[PDB]
Design a protein around this ligand. Structure first.
Ligand SMILES: CCCCCCCCOCCOCCOCCOCCO
Ligand SMILES: CCCCCCCCOCCOCCOCCOCCO
Ligand SMILES: CCCCCCCCOCCOCCOCCOCCO
Ligand SMILES: CCCCCCCCOCCOCCOCCOCCO
Ligand SMILES: CCCCCCCCOCCOCCOCCOCCO
Lengths: 543, 141
């Protein structure tokens, strides 16, 4: 029961001029909702935004259709369409039916690459480089589970969309069994079909089986775990002739077998003590060591489908995989060691925490022949500190000798009393070389440096029924704001009124460098967090 | 006696209820309880044993940094888990766990990235479980 109009809202943007929102709420059933919203845009046209929410036994979900008939600005991707129709379709679903059935949908499709640049939606932003289209249905009980999936992506560049691989379909299966004698056993399996739009690119069917036997020895203090794993993979790669006769392309093989055994031994111990002058507090000292061995296997005859360099933080030090997917299994012959100290107080609250770890390589990690070689090459650390009941601090850093010392680092401090008072400082750094290594096809600093971003966010009451929010993010190398948000709120017996300004980097001018910004200043009534969660860098509460 | 000794949940044996008993999070929690020598039984009805109730969990993903051209640089995955510890001796002690991960985005390798995300999520779930078990200490005291 609510089927009326909703109080309108308005705004003024640097790209669409004056904008006017007039929402209408339907209320079809206790478990069905709809919203139809004319959205006038001075310079662009009249948009219609439809949102349909449902709640059923297979799960809860939301569908959405945005439709703008006659765009008077857009022209085309090709530079020439004129009077084109802008549209967006969204479907999200999540649910566990009858405890054993599992359904998940994350589908987004737009009419053109420049949609989110020009139009505002809850299902996208100017930071997005593509749209995700994923369907997932699976069964699961205590002993095993299986999952069928369709994974496809709409990349907002011709090149990206053309060469973007799809998983269609993907089958993931897991079988578990404890107490198989002294061991715990686990078998994982996968069957996938990778295809892409570009006819030149190879298609592939990949099958993978991976049994794992585990000997876990646990205690009140410390624990050790021995693990034997078998990685078995078969590839059926269909390779077009045009691909094989390229002067720059790798010689792929039609049928590929890869079988690699993996040995891992991982141990951890927990010392502790009552601190001396400070009585009641406890300091814990937790050493951890892991040896990993995987033999080398040349995999140049396998193409890349779903495989990228995984990003390692302090935890990732003890991860047995370097890459994602299954197209590259690096040889391993290394020891990862780490030390974790904790501090508990009177009430057994973890108040301080610090971890430092490292990886020592006995031999080079390889995946092929396409080649600062051994020793302690990777370092990583993180830290957390509960300064008081309302103030928190945490941060982390990563080093790789092969990429020139420091690669990643970040720190964030946050104060918060209730949900009216909040302050947050943060800094993020990423070396150029790290970006060039971890995510290629977006390399060294050709105008694209590493990351060095300082950020502040706040929400504070200032008068009797007044409230102000702010958010400033600054790029220190380019010496310019990345994002900025200033806001006021007014309260009375009723609820709240919100007024806000926002200026963000939204594009790039190719000639004579410089970045393209956009302005927004608007009003709604229908706050605080709702305004904090609106920019390209929305507020996420730390801790 | 002053310097380092080896020890460190006192009390064992509990009930385990969850909104998603066959979900991956519940599996991680079971693995972790099992690693800490906690016997997970089927009793209910005649409680007089502490219980661990997983109310629910939510996942989040936002952009935390951008490049000069406005495109996303680093993305952050967030896992929230809400739990409750019911001890028959006294009242209920609520628990909450938040886990964070960060990775660079790459529109030219979207599928790969999705894969990466899944891995991350897995790890995060595991980490959550760990904290939960450790937080049982806070419940004890
Ligand atoms: C392979 C990874 C871990 C192995 C390292 C230690 C192996 C020691 O275990 C010996 C294996 O023998 C197990 C057979 O035990 C009997 C199983 O059936 C008894 C159940 O009633
Ligand atoms: C110049 C190359 C060799 C010189 C230094 C080699 C050092 C090798 O010794 C490393 C000691 O650690 C061995 C593995 O650590 C044990 C891990 O597994 C135990 C589980 O608790
Ligand atoms: C088939 C390709 C040829 C590659 C074989 C190279 C073999 C070189 O092995 C060097 C081994 O380095 C010694 C590692 O030290 C042992 C540490 O691990 C001890 C486990 O606790
Ligand atoms: C509102 C709650 C009370 C907060 C007051 C702080 C009480 C003191 O206990 C703090 C325990 O944490 C230890 C501090 O951690 C050390 C960090 O700095 C050491 C590194 O040089
Ligand atoms: C306990 C006081 C300080 C602890 C705060 C947490 C910080 C831990 O992580 C540090 C990460 O800081 C990033 C390193 O700074 C990068 C800039 O230097 C790069 C050189 O160009």
């Amino acid at each position: 029961s609510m089927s009326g109009f909703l109080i309108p809202n308005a705004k003024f943007t640097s790209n669409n001029g004056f904008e006017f929102l007039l929402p209408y709420y339907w209320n079809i059933a206790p478990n069905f909702d709809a919203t139809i919203t004319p959205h006038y845009m001075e310079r662009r046209g009249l948009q219609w935004q439809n949102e349909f929410r449902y709640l059923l036994a297979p799960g809860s979900g939301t569908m959405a259709l945005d439709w703008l008939p006659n765009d008077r600005i857009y022209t085309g991707p090709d530079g020439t369409d004129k009077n084109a129709t802008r549209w967006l379709y969204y479907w999200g679903h999540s649910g566990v039916m009858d405890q054993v059935w599992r359904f998940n949908i994350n589908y987004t499709r737009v009419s053109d690459p420049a949609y989110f640049t020009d139009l505002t939606s809850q299902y996208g932003s100017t930071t997005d480089g593509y749209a995700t289209q994923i369907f997932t249905a699976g069964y699961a009980n205590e002993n095993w589970n299986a999952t069928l999936s369709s994974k496809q992506f709409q990349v907002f560049t011709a090149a990206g969309n053309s060469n973007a691989y799809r998983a269609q379909p993907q089958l993931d299966m897991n079988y578990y069994k404890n107490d198989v004698g002294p061991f715990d056993m686990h078998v994982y399996g996968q069957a996938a079909k990778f295809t892409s739009v570009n006819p030149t690119n190879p298609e592939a069917s990949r099958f993978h089986i991976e049994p794992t036997v585990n000997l876990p020895l646990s205690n009140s203090w410390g624990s050790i775990n021995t693990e034997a794993k078998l990685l078995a993979t078969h590839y059926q790669q269909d390779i077009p002739a045009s691909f094989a006769d390229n002067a720059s392309n790798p010689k792929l093989k039609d049928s590929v077998n890869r079988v690699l055994p993996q040995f891992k031994v991982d141990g951890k111990v927990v010392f502790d003590r009552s601190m001396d002058w400070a009585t009641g507090f406890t300091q814990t000292l937790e050493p951890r060591a892991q040896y990993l061995y995987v033999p080398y296997r040349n995999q140049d005859d396998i193409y890349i489908y779903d495989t990228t360099l995984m990003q390692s933080d302090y935890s990732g030090l003890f991860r047995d995989r370097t890459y994602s997917g299954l197209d590259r299994i690096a040889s391993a012959n290394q020891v990862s060691t780490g030390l974790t100290s904790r501090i508990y107080d009177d009430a057994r609250v973890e108040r301080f925490n610090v971890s430092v770890g490292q990886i020592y390589y006995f031999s080079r990690s390889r995946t092929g022949n396409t080649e600062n070689a051994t020793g302690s090459l990777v370092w990583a650390g993180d830290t957390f500190w509960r300064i008081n009941d309302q103030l928190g601090l945490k941060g982390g850093a990563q080093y790789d000798t092969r990429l020139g010392s420091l690669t990643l680092g970040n720190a964030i401090m946050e104060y918060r009393k209730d949900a009216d008072r909040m302050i947050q400082l943060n800094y993020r750094y990423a070396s150029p070389k790290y970006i060039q290594a971890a995510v290629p096809k977006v390399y060294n600093p050709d105008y694209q440096q590493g990351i060095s971003q300082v950020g502040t966010t706040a929400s504070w009451p200032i008068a009797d029924r007044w409230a102000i929010v702010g958010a400033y993010y600054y790029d220190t190398k380019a010496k310019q704001p990345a994002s900025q948000l200033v806001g006021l709120q007014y309260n009375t017996c009723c609820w709240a009124v919100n007024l806000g300004y926002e200026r963000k980097i939204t594009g790039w001018n190719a000639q004579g460098q410089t970045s393209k910004y956009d302005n927004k200043i608007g009003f709604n009534i229908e706050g605080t967090a709702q305004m904090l969660n609106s920019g390209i860098l929305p507020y996420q509460s730390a801790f | 006696f002053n310097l380092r000794g080896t020890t460190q949940t006192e009390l064992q044996k509990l009930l385990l209820e969850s909104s998603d008993p066959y979900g991956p999070l519940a599996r991680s929690i079971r693995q972790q309880l099992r690693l800490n020598n906690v016997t997970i039984v089927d009793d209910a009805m005649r409680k007089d044993i502490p219980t661990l109730r997983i109310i629910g969990s939510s996942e989040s993903q936002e952009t935390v940094s951008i490049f000069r051209n406005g495109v996303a640089a680093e993305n952050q995955l967030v896992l929230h888990v809400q739990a409750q510890v019911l001890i028959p001796g006294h009242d209920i002690y609520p628990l909450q766990v938040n886990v964070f991960r960060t990775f660079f985005d790459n529109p030219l390798t979207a599928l790969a990235k999705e894969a990466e995300a899944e891995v991350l999520r897995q790890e995060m779930r595991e980490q959550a479980a760990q904290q939960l078990v450790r937080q049982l200490l806070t419940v004890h005291a």
